[PDB]
Design a binder for this molecule. Sequence first.
Ligand SMILES: NC[C@@H](O)c1ccc(F)cc1
Length: 330
Amino acid sequence: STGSATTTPIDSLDDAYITPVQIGTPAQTLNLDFDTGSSDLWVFSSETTASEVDGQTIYTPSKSTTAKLLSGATWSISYGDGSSSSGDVYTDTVSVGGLTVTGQAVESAKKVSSSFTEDSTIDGLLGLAFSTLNTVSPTQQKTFFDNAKASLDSPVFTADLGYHAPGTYNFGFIDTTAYTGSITYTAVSTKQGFWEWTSTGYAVGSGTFKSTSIDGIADTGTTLLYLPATVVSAYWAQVSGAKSSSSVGGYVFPCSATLPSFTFGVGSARIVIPGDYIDFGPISTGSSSCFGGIQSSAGIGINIFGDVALKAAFVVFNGATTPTLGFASK
Ligand SMILES: NC[C@@H](O)c1ccc(F)cc1
């Protein structure tokens, strides 16, 4: 089997992407944030505290003939950005782009933190990291990808995120028309439960490539590119007027600037992020100070190849017995 679904930016800055997902019988379609940095499939629901729902589409398990309470199971998750959610668990039929999994754990939110409530466009998350990170207790549950894997033509999914435009998540096949040149594959460590890999270096604009190992994660659920302070300082030093602002919480730059590109290495291959991809617009409405899309990972403990980086590539998440990651230009 295979699946193919379009993923769409939630706003004009590409802050996140949503992908329609069919849950239950008859189908209830919710727009979920596919997150290769976490491993829980959770949704706003009929059980979510009413004051914490503001415009989201909810899953109502009582209206699904295939929903079954997973007795005694609870979940609770805290994300890198400080947001969180928790609740109980059903199993139900879940389909993405024509690919169907029966008996998928669907984690029903009883509580969500303010940032979720405040984002009416995201109805929940669909985790695509390794199932070892799944938070369901007392019986840990598998991701949609893990459940689907044995049925897929090939044990892979791909992320093709657009810049200010829709893109695609494919399951079970590699669309050879969706990228240019060849795909370069690189080793993954699953020890922390992430799609963790090591970039071979970077360049700023038309500058020379610096060969240096940068260990990080491929995370579709993180907006920005978070790299070591040395790398980030080298990037922003090429932008007149750019500075790190403790009050804003990172590097800002004059909105009048033209940003240089940023290149990262994948083995001997190179992925170029155009400068425009690094512009996240005014820090507040009407400001001439703009927020940068490359930020320091120093306070995080891990480097993060988030959407800013991933959207510049066609990315293969290879879930073979020994997982790997592939990157191509597009
Ligand atoms: N995208 C999941 C989010 O919780 C996350 C953020 C940062 C990180 F290093 C790992 C995961």
